[PDB]
Structure 1
């Protein structure tokens, strides 16, 4: 289900309207503890407890940040790490030296993706400690920014229903032609077997005719 999740008119309406406050230092309306978890349950993510974000652990925040990247940005964290350290055919690198930098660069790639995404939504200061040493107050500011991007996305997804539906029409045309190609080959293949069965019956009948007549003669 890709690009089909983005097609909604009155299907969900589970998110409030996008709000902006020119008052507070951050352009986002800083959500409190209760209003931040009412989405993440209706929103596609999963939450253990509202207290687990009030005291964010290092392992839970990395899991929650990986799911956020895989949803809003539409990229796989595991697939990008495999492509970030692809086995290069150059004869200069060493496999013993490569084992040292595999763990370091994999964590640095996850940082750049989270830093770029938070930079676009309006947070230009994303550290490596934001995941492996979470803070209760700093997470609330980071999570209040991604939910406002979620409310804004629901209002904009109405303008994108035109493109998604036209993609289904074009994809349906190719699938229809390929189904006709398989249907034409299956119909002819059945036509051959029916004739081969009747011919095999005629060969047995003619051979039986000669065998019975060969007994009375000769």
Structure 2
């Protein structure tokens, strides 16, 4: 495979569609591409391409580096684009399957060469478009299941953080121990019944004191 080679006419359409936006796209014609490409137009195109592929602000191409040391910063504006183009374009065109891009191509664009470079860029743009679809699908499968692990740590650490008589017994036990008796609760509707020997007293036909005395006489 070498990449498909568009004719100038088709190159304008693809650039309008994918690279140049609004007024910049509208103004593009075959004329500023062939037979004498226009450096200013090509600069615009390469900058846009780089901004799309790498995410680079247009600003970044017009930046005056720190202790520059230049006499007249403002006489420098025409040169600035170039400096920043070169470095990125050396890396980017190989990716587009172009291996013979040279600074002359930025400074003084030739017809047949820039046509081939533009097709290289355009074809890569279509390919990544296809790659974007599948990447984004994968990036909503993993980041969505990351949301399902946020909620799975919300319900797990909350329910891990929630997990993170000595007066009535001794009174009721002394009765049982010192007397050595226990009631049967089958004491009819009135009588008293229990075990010590079996104790069986009527209580309707017996005094309270008689019952007390009979119980303590066995202790």
TM-score bracket for the superposition, by shorter chain length: 0.5 to 0.7
Task: Give the CA deviation at 1:122.
Answer: 1.3
Paired residue for 1:28? 3
Q: TM-score, normalised by structure 2?
A: 0.52
Q: Cα distance 1:97–1:144, how it changes in 2: closer, same or farther (>3 A)?
A: same
The 5 Å alignment of 1:1-218 reads 20=1, 27-45=2-20, 46=25, 48-54=28-34, 55-79=36-60, 82=63, 85-87=65-67, 95=69, 107-165=82-140
The alpha carbon displacement at 1:159 in A equals: 0.7
Structure 1 residues 45-67: Cα deviation after superposition (integer angstroms, max 9, x where no partner): 22521222113112111122111
| 8 A Cα contact 1:62 1:131, kept in partner | yes
Provide the C-alpha distance between the structure 1 equivalents of 2:84 and 2:72, rounded to a whole number of angstroms: 16
CA–CA distance in structure 1, aligned partners of residues 135 and 70 of structure 2: 50
Paired positions, count: 140
- How well do the aligned residues superpose, as a CA RMSD in angstroms? 3.4
Structure 2 spans left out of the alignment, 5+ residues: 148-219
How far 1:154 moved relative to its partner? 2.0
Displacement of 1:116 in angstroms is 1.0
Higher helix share: 1
Higher relative contact order, structure no. (Cα contacts within 8 Å, ≥ 6 residues apart): 1
Normalised TM-score (structure 1)? 0.52
User: Which whole-Å CA distance do the structure 1 matches of 2:96 and 2:31 have between them?
Assistant: 25
Flag structure 1 segments of 5+ consecutive residues without an equivalent: 1-19, 21-26, 88-93, 173-218
**Secondary structure in 2 aligned to 1:159?**
helix
Q: CA deviation at 1:86?
A: 2.9
Q: Once the 2 structures are TM-superposed, how far is the Cα of residue 95 of structure 1 from its aligned partner? A: 3.7
Q: 1:111 to 1:95 in 2, by over 3 A?
A: closer
- Indicate how the Cα distance of structure 1 residues 151 and 98 shifts in structure 2: closer, same or farther if over 3 A, else same: same
Q: How far apart, in 1, do the equivalents of 2:135 and 2:84 lie?
A: 31
Does the 8 Å CA contact 1:62/1:132 hold for their aligned counterparts?
no
Give the structure with the larger strand fraction.
2
- Give distance in 2, aligned partners of 1:96 and 1:115: 26
Query: In 1, distance between residues paired with 2:40 and 2:62?
Result: 19
